[PDB]
């Protein structure tokens, strides 16, 4: 450990075009393994990792019906949200769920998640105590009151401590050949002429897993995270990730700049120059 299981569920209303779009994807750490797509030829819960193709048909059947139930939940919640905020019925809107659990060195629950969002903003979320809710606006206070009265926090907590955590261990055993790996980043600094006065130093990080990494430029101990360009971490497409950070430095002073890479696969953080 530690490890994490996450589902990212999206519904997008399409008035005048048909029923809402609905898609759910499941991730173990930074590895996707399942999906449900309402716009596919045959909408059904299906594997997206090779180590999931050995599950019986009753796994996919039960997961599909749960996904079909949630799709109806999103259709209702989208209409209710439209009403809560007194919005026009002709606009497209988004509702998102994000739920899962974190397990650790000994493979038991660190933290459970039940997060909900409307049009890309926090709506309501289950607190870490797995008992109380945090509502983002007064419309979500209505939701929170209703879910508090019904005791849905106990329903979610039972899932987080039971199904979420026990199935995460099962996934971690099915894909133990690939999921438990730790690929250290291969890092180096490149040189790119820019002007007659300065030059670009680009620090690369390649082929690392998991995706979490820190790239930092410093000038003689002092730090440069204000002045640098830092792209988002991106997937290579083969199961590893990439990232780079660049800085504009004056000609002749490249050796005064150092790039630092922090990663779970790095025993000691790397410090690089050109």
């Amino acid at each position: 450990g530690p490890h994490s299981l996450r589902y990212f569920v999206t519904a997008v209303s399409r008035p005048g075009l048909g029923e809402p779009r609905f898609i759910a994807v499941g991730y173990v750490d930074d590895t996707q393994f399942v999906r449900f797509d309402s716009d596919a030829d045959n909408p059904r819960f299906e594997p997206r990792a090779p180590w999931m193709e050995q599950e019986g048909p009753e796994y996919w059947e039960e997961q599909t019906q749960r996904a079909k139930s949630d799709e109806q939940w999103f259709r209702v919640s989208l209409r209710t949200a439209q009403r809560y905020y007194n919005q026009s019925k002709g606009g497209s809107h988004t509702f998102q769920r994000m739920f899962g659990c974190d397990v650790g060195s000994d493979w038991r629950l660190l933290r459970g998640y039940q997060q909900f969002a409307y049009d890309g903003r926090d709506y309501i979320a289950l607190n870490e105590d797995l008992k109380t809710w945090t509502a983002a606006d007064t419309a979500a206070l209505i939701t929170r009151r209703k879910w508090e009265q019904a005791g849905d926090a106990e329903y979610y907590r039972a899932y987080l401590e039971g199904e979420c955590v026990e199935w995460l261990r099962r996934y971690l055993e099915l894909g133990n050949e690939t999921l438990l790996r730790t690929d250290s980043p291969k890092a180096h600094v490149t040189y790119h002429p820019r002007s007659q006065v300065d030059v670009t130093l680009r620090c690369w990080a390649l082929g690392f897993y998991p995706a979490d990494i820190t790239l930092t430029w410093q000038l003689n101990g002092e730090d440069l995270t204000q002045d640098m360009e830092l792209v988002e971490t991106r997937p290579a497409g083969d199961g590893t990730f990439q990232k780079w950070a660049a800085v504009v430095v004056p000609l002749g002073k490249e050796q005064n700049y150092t790039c630092h890479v922090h990663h779970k696969g790095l025993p000691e953080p790397l410090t690089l120059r050109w």
Binding site: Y7, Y84, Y123, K146, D152, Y159
Partner: peptide
């Protein structure tokens, strides 16, 4: 394992 949301907003 997918988690059911028991009640809508």
């Amino acid at each position: 394992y997918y988690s059911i949301a028991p009640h809508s907003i």
